[PDB]
């Protein structure tokens, strides 16, 4: 055609996968479009030149010597220009007094509105707090089914439970790790409220078709996103999405924080009651609900987040870059059945790096990818929901099997990923996994 | 020989340290504890201390024409500004923020300041006094015996964590629950007694002990506005604390603690503030589900740092309390207010006088409008007068004469660390001046 197609840069999952085929290409010129938004701060002065990826973005260094490779460095997670931007935005809001109750708060909300393109967003002390308060304004009752995948990190259970609802486990799609909408009718019972699928390790669940089964038993849907924002349409089919800003996040603040993001005006205004002691909006002292918690994001926070989501846009393009250079580098590994890979999807924003490989092989290959190469890898999460140690699960969830979830919990290793990681430690990731595998099937 | 005068910073002592620097001297050696909450006193107690002069820098002439009453700008000090970017500028680049080193060297500093055995520092005072009702063995529908004129906060904690508040009527001179009508509400279904020491000023926590260990019933204290009493948490099984920036000492975010002797008790409290996790074992959960309430290691961090104030700030509200009872003396002795008594058992966090019912209105009205003096009343509502369906199904045609009478009368005059004399002047003189209208 002679008509060059542009490439809006909006730094979301999808968009990122066009950028990841043009940034690898030798014109980069003026179909590359940045969306006019904060989380494109970083790219404005990278994208002024042509890019070559490994160099300009990666700084790479084939030559640099790894004796160690550690998960996830948190002192990594946080960049010297990071901490300059906090520095200076902390010299002018210390002395305001305001830390709690603030101004930054409504305009961090602002901006997460816009980016999210979701009318209402209330910022909260956390992303499990994002959670309990969503189904507390959504109507959740003592006693209220919740379905959910048992695979999550432990804070989507403990905000079900913490709010009184009761969370019914069913099995995840063995290769996205996500709910598996094809089992989830089976549960529905007449106490089923909810469902809360989980975009897990950043993937996106399979949003469409829950919605479609929770329109069809009238069913309300709230989303747990804490390790998916970026991910296109977020929130298309969702009635509340949480969001968390903990430090480890895709995009985080210097402390615990979160959202709740929503159309509905009505849900919106619960939110926030519950979100401040059950009291009328903006109107301390007046209870207008039973209760509420002290459960708002810090005015800080939100001055420290309004800096931070400077690098959003390009910090996920980093993990999109890495993501597919796991794929494409180990993808012998697979080929010859050894491991499985994480597909190089549009709808993933890369928090962890999953791949599956022999249940049999895993606590070995963990052990000589660190005793052999210093290379660190993890299991995120150790124990499932219904094999937790509690009283509640052995009085209630016995006789539970959930064939899938428990296979791939049994296969999962996650490979270091996040923005700061090198690809000369990606490297030695990569030929200790080849090494170590070989040795694996003899 | 010299008897040594002793500056612990708690509530006790700096009553003996005001009266001995008034110049009716308690001994003679000025002896600082070696304490973070006083290092920052080292700075200026000398020994022949001009309070006024060294401790306020008052300036009897200098020009006002409005007196806030509580400037959050002010509660922040340059010098607090300029210790927590130093802090920061260290912890920035760790990139721990949540987890982290400053929070068990945070709580250990807290743990000596109490002389409690553990502490465990939360996401703020509320979540403080929900966890600690949990951990202590709250159970949906258990019934928590407490006032109803604290902060919506009290209530919402028990409320959320499946608790039935059960208000009681206060005395209305302490505006602290009146023990003498705990026994009276005590049903099989109560298990909690949840005494407020509200403003600063200390509940009567050895009768209340008495009361409890009567009826075998637990005693959580929500000593949010208290930080600095002495003998604080003797007489109960957990005292909470809230460190907000407003408060007698706070960090910048929102943050509490835990506070307790018993171990057992302690690690219920851990495992609830973190998601039911054993504990110092991530992903393990050893009881149904917990929240996710820890207090932040960036936050720890600034309170390591604002802590440093706490006794000195403690003893500049206590000057300031004294200096309103004394210079509005003869508006008590002639009946047109109530004071607060001068008492060792207090920290002033907010300072309440209590003027005629039909007059209050006018009385706010025209400090302000006259005299830019702006006051407040903590709080606006009682518990058992909000408007929420819970109050219409359960506590409706409830009478609390004393608490309902207290309410109507307490009025709140500006009081705060970096609160200065000469503002002060222009609140007391206004007192006077719009009272002495009225008659
Ligand atoms: C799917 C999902 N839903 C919900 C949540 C809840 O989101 P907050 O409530 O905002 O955490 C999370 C959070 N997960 C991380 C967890 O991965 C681990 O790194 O531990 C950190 C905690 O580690 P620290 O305590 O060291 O920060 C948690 O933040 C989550 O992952
Ligand atoms: C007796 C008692 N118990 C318990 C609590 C609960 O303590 P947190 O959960 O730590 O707040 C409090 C807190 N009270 C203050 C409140 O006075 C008002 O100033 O509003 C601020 C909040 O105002 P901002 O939202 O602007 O910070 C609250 O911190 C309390 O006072």
Redesign the interface.
Known sequence: AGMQKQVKISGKSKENMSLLKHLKGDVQGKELVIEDSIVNERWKQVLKEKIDIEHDLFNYQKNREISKVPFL??????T?DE?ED??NT??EV???????SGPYLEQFEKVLSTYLHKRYVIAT?????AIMIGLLALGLN?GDEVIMPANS???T??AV??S?GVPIYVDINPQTFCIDPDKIEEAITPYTKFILPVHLYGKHSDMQHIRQIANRYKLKVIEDACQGIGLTDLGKYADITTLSF??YKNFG????AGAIATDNEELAKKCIQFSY???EVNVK??????????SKM?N??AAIGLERMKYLSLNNFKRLFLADRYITQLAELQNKGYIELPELSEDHVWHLFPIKVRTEDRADIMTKLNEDFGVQTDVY???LSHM?????VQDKYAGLQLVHTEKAHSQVLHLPLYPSFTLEEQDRVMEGLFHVIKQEIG
């Open positions: 460095p948190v002192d990594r997670l946080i010297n901490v906090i520095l902390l010299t210390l002395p305001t007094g305001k830390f709690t002390s956390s992303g499990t707090d003592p990190f432990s804070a259970e403990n439970l913490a009184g903990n430090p603040v210097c402390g615990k002691h059950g009291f002292n007046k209870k207008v609900i039973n209760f509420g918690f002290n810090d800080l926070q999460y150790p124990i937790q140690k509690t009283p509640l």
